[PDB]
Design an enzyme around this catalytic site. Structure first.
Site, PDB file in Angstrom:
ATOM      1  N   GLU A 191       1.068  -1.227  -0.033  1.00 30.38           N
ATOM      2  CA  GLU A 191      -0.080   0.075  -0.108  1.00 30.38           C
ATOM      3  C   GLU A 191       0.861   1.252  -0.113  1.00 30.38           C
ATOM      4  O   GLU A 191       0.735   2.129  -0.858  1.00 30.38           O
ATOM      5  CB  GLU A 191      -0.962  -0.066   1.333  1.00 30.38           C
ATOM      6  CG  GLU A 191      -2.000  -0.965   1.121  1.00 30.38           C
ATOM      7  CD  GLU A 191      -3.168  -0.831  -0.016  1.00 30.38           C
ATOM      8  OE1 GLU A 191      -2.888   0.400  -0.454  1.00 30.38           O
ATOM      9  OE2 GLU A 191      -3.722  -1.520  -0.284  1.00 30.38           O
TER      10      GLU A 191
ATOM     11  N   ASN B  36      -7.640   9.026  -5.527  1.00 33.74           N
ATOM     12  CA  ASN B  36      -8.370   8.079  -6.468  1.00 33.74           C
ATOM     13  C   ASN B  36      -9.315   8.756  -7.390  1.00 33.74           C
ATOM     14  O   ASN B  36      -9.480   9.949  -7.534  1.00 33.74           O
ATOM     15  CB  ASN B  36      -9.429   7.290  -5.477  1.00 33.74           C
ATOM     16  CG  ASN B  36      -8.579   6.687  -4.381  1.00 33.74           C
ATOM     17  OD1 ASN B  36      -8.982   7.094  -3.181  1.00 33.74           O
ATOM     18  ND2 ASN B  36      -7.699   6.186  -4.613  1.00 33.74           N
TER      19      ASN B  36
ATOM     20  N   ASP C  17     -12.370   8.721  -7.869  1.00 32.63           N
ATOM     21  CA  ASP C  17     -13.664   9.506  -7.331  1.00 32.63           C
ATOM     22  C   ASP C  17     -13.396  10.535  -6.606  1.00 32.63           C
ATOM     23  O   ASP C  17     -14.462  11.049  -6.114  1.00 32.63           O
ATOM     24  CB  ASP C  17     -14.560   8.294  -6.636  1.00 32.63           C
ATOM     25  CG  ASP C  17     -13.743   7.885  -5.328  1.00 32.63           C
ATOM     26  OD1 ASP C  17     -12.728   8.449  -4.973  1.00 32.63           O
ATOM     27  OD2 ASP C  17     -14.612   7.167  -4.434  1.00 32.63           O
TER      28      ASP C  17
ATOM     29  N   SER D  64     -11.644  10.873  -3.922  1.00 34.46           N
ATOM     30  CA  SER D  64     -11.137  10.494  -2.609  1.00 34.46           C
ATOM     31  C   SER D  64      -9.515  10.586  -2.659  1.00 34.46           C
ATOM     32  O   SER D  64      -8.910  10.387  -3.883  1.00 34.46           O
ATOM     33  CB  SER D  64     -11.675   9.674  -2.113  1.00 34.46           C
ATOM     34  OG  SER D  64     -11.391   8.294  -2.809  1.00 34.46           O
TER      35      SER D  64
ATOM     36  N   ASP E 240      -6.370   8.434  -0.400  1.00 36.29           N
ATOM     37  CA  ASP E 240      -5.831   7.368   0.303  1.00 36.29           C
ATOM     38  C   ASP E 240      -4.452   7.942   1.013  1.00 36.29           C
ATOM     39  O   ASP E 240      -3.927   8.372   0.526  1.00 36.29           O
ATOM     40  CB  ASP E 240      -5.165   6.117  -0.391  1.00 36.29           C
ATOM     41  CG  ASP E 240      -6.600   5.410  -0.962  1.00 36.29           C
ATOM     42  OD1 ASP E 240      -7.889   5.700  -0.629  1.00 36.29           O
ATOM     43  OD2 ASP E 240      -6.277   4.333  -1.512  1.00 36.29           O
TER      44      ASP E 240
ATOM     45  N   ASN F 264      -8.949   5.478   3.135  1.00 34.56           N
ATOM     46  CA  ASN F 264      -9.759   6.496   2.064  1.00 34.56           C
ATOM     47  C   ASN F 264     -10.291   7.312   2.915  1.00 34.56           C
ATOM     48  O   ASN F 264     -11.206   7.146   3.756  1.00 34.56           O
ATOM     49  CB  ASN F 264     -10.508   5.433   1.270  1.00 34.56           C
ATOM     50  CG  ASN F 264     -10.931   6.152   0.294  1.00 34.56           C
ATOM     51  OD1 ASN F 264     -12.064   6.503   0.140  1.00 34.56           O
ATOM     52  ND2 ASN F 264     -10.376   6.498  -1.112  1.00 34.56           N
TER      53      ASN F 264
END
Ligand SMILES: [Cl-]
Ligand SMILES: [Cl-]
Ligand SMILES: [Cl-]
Ligand code: NA
Length: 129
Positions: free
Chosen positions: A35, A46, A48, A50, A52, A59
């Site tokens: 990650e 991301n 959309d 958002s 991380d 998120n």
């Protein structure tokens, strides 16, 4: 902070992640490796809108507040910047909520694609734990 592998294993264990929701410590170290490459400051946007955050790439649509993810929940009740700290407490405590929400570690795409089904104990081999 960029953690060493065994350094992160020890911190995750101290904070109660070893065997949390049945996931052995190597699962958590493997997840963090893929990650964030063990870097607490990692951030990734991301599609959309958002983002991380942190060592486990938590998120902003569901778990933390970053002020720029419309429709976001803040289920861990923390600013997303708290997930970038050298102290992993907030990330660990939020990860505990995530992994308890029903889908287990499948919440972490890198875990499902790069850790699940593999010899995850390799990630804690050699460490004094
Ligand atoms: Cl393990
Ligand atoms: Cl927001
Ligand atoms: Cl599970
Ligand atoms: Na949010």
């Amino acid at each position: 902070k960029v953690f060493g592998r065994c350094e992160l294993a020890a911190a995750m264990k101290r904070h109660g992640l070893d065997n949390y929701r049945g996931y052995s410590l190597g699962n958590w170290v493997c997840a963090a490796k893929f990650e964030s490459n063990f870097n607490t400051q990692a951030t990734n946007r991301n599609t959309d809108g958002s983002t991380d955050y942190g060592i486990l790439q938590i998120n902003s649509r569901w778990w933390c507040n970053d002020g720029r993810t419309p429709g976001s929940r803040n289920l861990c009740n923390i600013p997303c910047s708290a997930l970038l700290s050298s102290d992993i407490t907030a990330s660990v405590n939020c990860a505990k909520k995530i992994v308890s929400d029903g889908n287990g570690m499948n919440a972490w795409v890198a875990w499902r694609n790069r850790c699940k089904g593999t010899d995850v104990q390799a990630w804690i081999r050699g460490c004094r734990l």
